[PDB]
Amino acid sequence: SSLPSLRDVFANDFRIGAAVNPVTIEMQKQLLIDHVNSITAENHMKFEHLQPEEGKFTFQEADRIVDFACSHRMAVRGHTLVWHNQTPDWVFQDGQGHFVSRDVLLERMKCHISTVVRRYKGKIYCWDVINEAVADEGNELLRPSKWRQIIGDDFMEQAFLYAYEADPDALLFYNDYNECFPEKREKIFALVKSLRDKGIPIHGIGMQAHWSLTRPSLDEIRAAIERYASLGVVLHITGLDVSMFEFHDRRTDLAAPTSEMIERQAERYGQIFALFKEYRDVIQSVTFWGIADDHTWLDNFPVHGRKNWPLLFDEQHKPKPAFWRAVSV
C-alpha cells in the first residue's frame, strides 16, 4: 500500500527479478506484480523439464511463466541450457546404453539449444547458457560432467555458439555459485577470459549469490564484481538469497529464526544492496531465487526437511526488517 516497490526503488540501478514456477506465480502473484520487473524459471526451463525424452518437448509450464511475465511487462531470464544437473540420461546414451560420440552429443546439444532458444526469441533477453561448469573444490578448473567427458573441454565454446546462432540478440551468460570465494573467482575469471579471448559470444557472468550471513565478505563481493567487470562482461546477480545458516550449520530443529538472525540479515541485505547500487554501472539485474519465505529451495537444501528465511518478505508476504534496509540504500 504505502510500501515502496523494489523495481521502482532500483529503477535507475538494475532490474529486480524473482525465480518462479506456475504454482508460486499464483501463490505470490501480488508480490510479483508489485515489486519485480524480471522473472526466471526456478526449474521449468532446465533440460529435464523441456526435453524429458528425445524429441518430446514439454514447454507448457515454461510457456505459462513467459506468458505471465509478458502480460505484466517483466523481462525474462532463461535458465538454463547446459548443466551437469537436471539433464536426463538419454542425452548422453545411445540405444545400447553406452555413451554417445562427441559429434552425436553436439548434435543433441545444438538441437536442444536451437529448439528452446528459438521458441522464446524476442521474449527472453538472456540465457544462462552454461551453468556451474567450474569446479567448486580441488585444484582442477572444470567440474567433471558427461557433457565435458564426451565432448571435451570445448563443449562450452560450442554451447555459446549454438545459442548465439539461435538468438544473436540474446545476452549469453556463464552462471555459477560461490562466485566470490577467491579461489573459485579466479577459475571463473580464467574460464571466461579464455572464451572471450577466443571470440566466443559470452556477454555476461551470472553471480548466483547463494549467500549466508557471514560468507562471502563484502570485500570478497567487491573484489569479485571488479574482477568480473574487468573482462568487459555485464553482471547479473541471478539467484540471490541470504541463508540463516552457514554451510557448517546443519541444524534441523529451529522453528523460527532468532531475533539476532533477523537483525543480522537486515544489516547484511543493507550492505549487499549498497554495494550493488555502488556498482550500478556494471550490475544490470538482481534476481532473488524466490521472493518470500513461504517458498524457498533452502528449506530442503543443503538439509532436507527444515525451514529457512532467506528473502525480503516473510511467509505472510509482509516486509521483513531486511526489506527496509535494502530499499533505503
Phi and psi at residue 18, to the nearest 5°: -145, 140
Phi and psi at residue 287, to the nearest 5°: -105, 130
Within a domain: residue 142?
yes
CA angle 301-40-75, nearest 5°? 160
Length of the chain: 329
Within a domain: residue 129?
yes
Q: Is the peptide bond before 216 cis (omega within 30 degrees of 0)?
A: yes
Name the grid cell of 1. 500500500
Q: Is the distance from CB of 170 to CB of 127 less than 8 angstroms?
A: yes
Q: Is the distance from CB of 19 to CB of 296 less than 8 angstroms?
A: no
- Amino acid letter at 314? D
Q: What letters, b where the CB count within 10 A reaches 16 and e where it falls short, cover 170-179?
A: bbbbbbbbbb
Other CB atoms within 10 Å distance of the CB of residue 72: 14
Give the DSSP per-residue string, 177-224: SSTTSHHHHHHHHHHHHHHHHTT----EEEE--EEESSSS-HHHHHHH
Within a domain: residue 67?
yes
- Residue written as grid cell 527496509: 324
Of 148, 38, 146, 126, nearest in space to 86 by CA = 146
Phi and psi at residue 37, to the nearest 5°: -125, 20
Within a domain: residue 55?
yes
Helix (H, G, I), strand (E, B) or coil at 228: helix
Q: What letters, b where the CB count within 10 A reaches 16 and e where it falls short, cover 114-138?
A: eebbebbeeebbbbbbbbbbbeeee
Q: Is the distance from CB of 20 to CB of 239 less than 8 angstroms?
A: no
Within a domain: residue 151?
yes
* Residue 83 belongs to domain spanning: 6-327
Cα of first residue to Cα of last residue in the chain, in angstroms, is: 21
Resolution attained, angstroms: 2.3
Q: Is the peptide bond before 302 cis (omega within 30 degrees of 0)?
A: yes
Domain CATH for 164 = 3.20.20.80
Write 300-305 long-range contacts (CB < 8 A, 24+): 302/247, 302/250, 303/245, 303/250, 303/251, 303/252, 305/252
Give the span between the Cα atoms of 103 and 328, in whole angstroms: 53
Give the DSSP per-residue string, 278-306: HTTTTEEEEEESSSBTTS-GGGTSSSTT-
Helix (H, G, I), strand (E, B) or coil at 107: helix
Within a domain: residue 198?
yes
Name the grid cell of 53. 525424452
- Residue written as grid cell 504505502: 2
The DSSP call for residue 90 is: G
The DSSP call for residue 95 is: T
Give the DSSP per-residue string, 108-154: HHHHHHHHHHHHTBTTB-EEEEEES-B-SSSS-SB---HHHHHH-TT
Within a domain: residue 92?
yes
Phi and psi at residue 241, to the nearest 5°: -155, 155
Within a domain: residue 1?
no
Helix (H, G, I), strand (E, B) or coil at 251: coil
Other CB atoms within 10 Å distance of the CB of residue 37: 22
Total domains, the chain: 1
Other CB atoms within 10 Å distance of the CB of residue 52: 12
Of 131, 114, 56, 61, nearest in space to 88 by CA = 56
Q: Which residues fall within 8 angstroms of residue 248, CB to CB, at 6 or more apart?
A: none
